[PDB]
Amino acid sequence: NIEGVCDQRFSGLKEALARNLDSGEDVGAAIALTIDGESVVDMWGGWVDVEHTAPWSRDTVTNVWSCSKTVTALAALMLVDRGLLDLDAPVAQYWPEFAAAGKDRIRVRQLLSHTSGVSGWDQPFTLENICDDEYATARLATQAPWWEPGTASGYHALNYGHLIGEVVRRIDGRTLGRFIDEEIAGPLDADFRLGLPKSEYGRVSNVIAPPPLPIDIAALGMDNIMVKTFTAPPADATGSWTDGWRAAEIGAANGHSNARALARIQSVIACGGKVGDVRLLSEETIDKIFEEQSYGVDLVLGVPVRFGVGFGLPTPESVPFIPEGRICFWGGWGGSQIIIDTEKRMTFSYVMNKMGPGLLGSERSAQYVSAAYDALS
C-alpha cells in the first residue's frame, strides 16, 4: 500500500518500493522525483516503526543524515552567488581563530570538498560535546590538520556543518540552521530543518540503527584518520533520537526532512538556479559545483571519490548506480540519496528509517536509483 503520486514512466520504481516494503527490507520509505521543477514522483509507504504504530504519512520526516550536507553546501554557495563569500579566500579571512595551528592558508572551497585536513574533532570529544554548537565550533579552530590540505580528501563526517556554518555565521550574522530556514526552506516551502523542534516530534519517524559492527574499533588505533573521524563522537545512530541531537545545529548530519523536501530544495540546482520564481543561485555559481576539486581514495570512506564544491561527482567504481555526466549528488548514512541531474534537470531523493550498513548507498538505494534512471531512457 503506497500513497502519493507516481508517473506511469516510473512504474518499475513503484514496484521496487512496494516489494521492498512487503519484505521488510524497507520499514518506512519515501521516494521523490522532480523534473524541470515540477513534482513527477512523490510516494511513501510502510510504517513509522517496526511495531506498526502508525503508517508513513505525507509529512512524515526523519533524520536524513548526510543529505543535510547538500543543504549546508547550498547555503554556502548562496553567499558565493551574492558575492559575500570567496571560495578561493582563506577561511581565516572570515574566521580569524581558524588560522591557529598552521591553518591560515586553507581555502573555503577546501572545506566544501573535504580536503581541508580537518575531518573530525580531536579526541577529547563526546556525544554531549557535538550538541554544544559554539563549543564544538571553537574546538575545531584550535586543531592542526590531520593531513596536508589539498593533498587528499577526508570525509568531514560530522563536523562539515560546523566548519561551513561558522563561515556562514560570521558573514551573514545568522546561524547556519536559521539561514537555511529563512533563505532556503522558507522561500521554497520545503520541509527541511537542521534539528527537530519539539512542536514537530509527532511526525518524526526514528531511524532504525544499522546492524552492529562485529568489533568495536577501540583498541585498533587512532593513528588512522578514518578512526579519528568516525570516533570523534562515537558512532551511534541511536544518538539521533535524543533531545540534545534535535536541539543542536549539525549541518553534516542533523537534518530532519523527507524525500519530497530534498528533491524540491535541490531542484534549484537542477533547473539552473530558479524553480518557479524563487532564484537562489545563478548558473555561474552552479558551474563552480561541477569543477572537479579532488579525486583519489578518500582517507575516511576508504574508496575512490570525486568531490566537487559541496557535492560528490560521478564515481562509477564506487557509486555504480549513478551515471556519468554533469550530475552532482550525495547521500546519508543508511542509504538515503539526493541526486541532482542538471542534464535532465531532474532531482531524485530516497529517504528511509531502516538504516542499511554503509555510508554510501545500500542495496535498496541501488534499486531505486537504477529504476529511476532506467525509466528516463
Q: What is the DSSP letter of 204?
A: B
Cell numbers 570538498 correspond to 113
Concatenate the DSSP letters of all residues of 113-168 into one string: TT-SS--S--SS--HHHHT-HHHHHHHHHTPPPSS-TTTS----TTTHHHHHHHHH
H/E run at residue 346: strand 346-352
Q: What is the DSSP letter of 210?
A: P
DSSP three-state, residue 28: strand
H/E run at residue 278: strand 278-279
Contacts of 55 (CB under 8 A, 6+ apart): 1, 28, 45, 46, 47, 48
What's 73-87 look like in SS3?
Answer: HHHHHHHHHCCCCCC
The whole-angstrom separation of Cα 47 and Cα 69 is 26
The amino acid that residue 11 corresponds to is S
Least Cα distance to 146 among 38, 220, 230, 209 occurs for 230
Contacts of 162 (CB under 8 A, 6+ apart): 133, 136, 137, 140, 250, 251, 252
The amino acid that residue 43 corresponds to is M
For 36-63, b/e burial (b = at least 16 CB within 10 A) is ebebbbbbbbbbbeeeeeeebeeebbbb
The amino acid that residue 176 corresponds to is L
Contacts of 41 (CB under 8 A, 6+ apart): 5, 6, 7, 10, 13, 31, 32, 33, 372
Contacts of 189 (CB under 8 A, 6+ apart): 264
For residue 257, give the C-alpha cell. 526532512
C-alpha distances in Å from residue 97, one per residue of 138, 236, 357: 8, 30, 37
Domains of the chain, by residue range, sit at 1-377
Please tell me the experimental approach by which this structure was elucidated: X-ray
Give the CB-side neighbour count of residue 96, counting CA atoms within 13 A.
0
Q: Which sign does the torsion angle of CA 263, 344, 365, 288 carry?
A: negative
Least Cα distance to 59 among 114, 113, 4, 1 occurs for 4
Backbone angles phi, psi at 305, to 5 degrees: -140, 135
Q: How many helices (H) and strands (E) does the chain have?
A: 14, 14
Contacts of 72 (CB under 8 A, 6+ apart): 160, 161, 164, 165, 176, 180, 251, 252, 310
Concatenate the DSSP letters of all residues of 283-309 into one string: HHHHHHHTS--EEEE-TTT-SEEEE-S
Cβ pair 268, 188 in contact under 8 A: yes
Concatenate the DSSP letters of all residues of 3-18 into one string: EEEE-GGGHHHHHHHH
Cβ pair 61, 24 in contact under 8 A: no
Phi-psi region of 37 (alpha: psi -120 to 50; beta: other; left: phi over 0): left
